[PDB]
From Swiss-Prot:
Cystine residue pairs: C3-C14, C31-C127, C102-C119
Positions of glycan attachment: N23
Positions with a binding annotation for a carbohydrate: D71, P72, Q73, K74, R75, Q76, N108, N109, N110
Main location: secreted
Induction: Up-regulated by mucosal injury from active Crohn's disease or ulcerative colitis. Up-regulated in colorectal tumors. Up-regulated in epithelial cells at regenerating margins of peptic ulcers in the stomach and duodenum.
Shown stretch of the complete protein: 29 to 158 of 158
Record's keyword terms, sorted: Disulfide bond, Glycoprotein, Lectin, Secreted, Signal
Lineage start: Eukaryota, Metazoa, Chordata, Craniata, Vertebrata
Name of the featured protein: Regenerating islet-derived protein 4
Signal as UniProt keyword: yes
């Protein structure tokens, strides 16, 4: 039940991926359920995604993993749960589409490109926990 039994300690924090098909609504709720501030992978800069991606990259088996990226109230703005605000995101050779109600990585894109989808598509999801 602690952060170690089979759990991997990375970045001094505890995080783990789940290969279960769960909608973003049941996926995120399953995280904050710990009330420890647990939520879907949070990314404010490419530096963080660059290190975690090296682990979940999946170049040998890229799976559709969800992250903590969603739209506010249809204001055409992409923000994370904590309201994280990315400053000038990279955009070249890809298309966000609008992130609709929830954005995720399409398994068809080998470059792990992001894609907009409804928060009702049951798919894999990665969770994060703050120490």
């Amino acid at each position: 039940q602690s952060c170690a039994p089979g759990w991997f300690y990375h970045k001094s924090n505890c995080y783990g991926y789940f290969r279960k098909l769960r909608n973003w609504s049941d996926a995120e709720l399953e995280c904050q359920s710990y009330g420890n501030g647990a939520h879907l992978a949070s990314i404010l800069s490419l530096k963080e995604a660059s290190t975690i991606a090296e682990y979940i990259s999946g170049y040998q088996r890229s799976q559709s993993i969800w992250i903590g990226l969603h739209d506010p109230q249809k204001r055409q703005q992409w923000q994370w749960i904590d309201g994280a605000m990315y400053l000038y995101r990279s955009w070249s050779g890809k298309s966000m589409g609008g992130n609709k109600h929830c954005a995720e990585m399409s398994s068809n894109n080998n470059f792990l490109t992001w894609s907009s989808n409804e928060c009702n598509k049951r798919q894999h999801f990665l969770c994060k926990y703050r120490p």
